[PDB]
Amino acid sequence: KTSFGSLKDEDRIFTNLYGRHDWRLKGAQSRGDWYKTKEILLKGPDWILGEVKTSGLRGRGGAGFPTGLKWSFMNKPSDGRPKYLVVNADEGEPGTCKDREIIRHDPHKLVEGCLVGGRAMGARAAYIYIRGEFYNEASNLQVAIREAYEAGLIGKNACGSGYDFDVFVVRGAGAYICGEETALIESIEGKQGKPRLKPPFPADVGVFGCPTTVANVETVAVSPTICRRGGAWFASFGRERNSGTKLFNISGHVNNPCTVEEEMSVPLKELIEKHAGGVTGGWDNLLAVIPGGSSTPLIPKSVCETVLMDFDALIQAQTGLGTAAVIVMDRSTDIVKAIARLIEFYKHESCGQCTPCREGVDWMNKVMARFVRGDARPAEIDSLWEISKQIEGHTICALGDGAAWPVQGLIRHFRPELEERMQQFAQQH
Amino acid sequence: ASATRFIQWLRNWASGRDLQAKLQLRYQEISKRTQPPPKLPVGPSHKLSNNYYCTR
Ligand SMILES: Cc1cc2nc3c(=O)[nH]c(=O)nc-3n(C[C@H](O)[C@H](O)[C@H](O)COP(=O)(O)O)c2cc1C
């Protein structure tokens, strides 16, 4: 294969993405959910982990780590502590709204994924951490969980397999940092959402100090279908090491902003015009695209022409797939103001635990505010670049990196705009 | 500066020099005792980047 991105409906996983069919148990079963769940559970964790591995699935939460290998850290003899699966539904990355649709329109896929993924890990229960703003979405998930409990699909003797499994829903209280896996765990434990240093890794010491795996909603929700249809089916989509289908969010300056499922490695231009109805004002009006949520560096129009949407392709473009949330900016956008607002976002979300982000991100925010008005000198651009490199790789968690990268992207591709603004301000003062 | 012309000749002849051209007493050739403010330059470590102390 050389071309990707004409996914057929029969190959789509989230078939109620738009909520046009009954999201409840009766509709979910009619669409293939919960089918032969007992057989999957009886195959054993090694078979389930084997399927997840051969599918080439990678983390859909933004970091893209191989799921099969990650989940295998939990396949070990019990040492007396309970084992837990924590499903990350915090969905805080600006531009990203995919996990919201799964939770409210395909909740039973997430619940079944919790049971199947939990079985492979040997977990006794799944804690679903959903952000507190998603109140109606959380209630839908709770309604679905009650339906599954009453049909015996979860709880004692889940699906008749003799495996006891509970699914808990825990709501956040308004913190983007609580999407970070260790901050999420600390939040579940009743503390501030401040990340943990590693080691220990969560698979050894996690929620309540117990072996734990944190998985994104989308990563979990697809696992039952990978088991039913097989890893080879999943691995037949997208490039090698970039397998499967993916939920994309196309927001910003597009004619029809939308969420859609498409194959991995589809061209970015193909995605924006086939599904979102093209760029506002046409493709020639495109200025820049943030390809994977606010934490991934922007790329200009030239790069957008032929870049594919997968982990490897976007890395070579000096960015990343991230959450696959595409934010589109046309030529009428104040690009400096757009990025400054993201830095302001990271300033408001930093937990404040560690020095480079507590002080550095707030510092970068102040510099960006002056850059928007042009009230600076060109020498400060290289200073700002150097400051961002002192944050990246020196913080406890990746929020520090996620604040540096947007700044680096702007300087990389839009330095003359920054310098032009400075000239205007100096000319007028 | 105010010596009579005769006295200038006498001390010039006695010394054998043109003393009047290099008087040891200072008059108005010296700098004013009030000067404009300076604006002093800064050293080569006054930079906003590429200036890590471990390299200097
Ligand atoms: C500031 C920050 C916010 C994050 N928010 C989310 C999130 O909302 N949802 C998510 O799945 N992962 C989020 N992550 C990534 C998680 O830390 C973690 O990598 C992921 O949940 C692992 O699950 P996965 O392997 O299925 O992707 C965030 C990371 C950081 C640093």
Ligand code: SF4
């Ligand atoms: S990088 Fe920022 S959000 Fe992450 S632990 Fe440090 S201060 Fe907290």
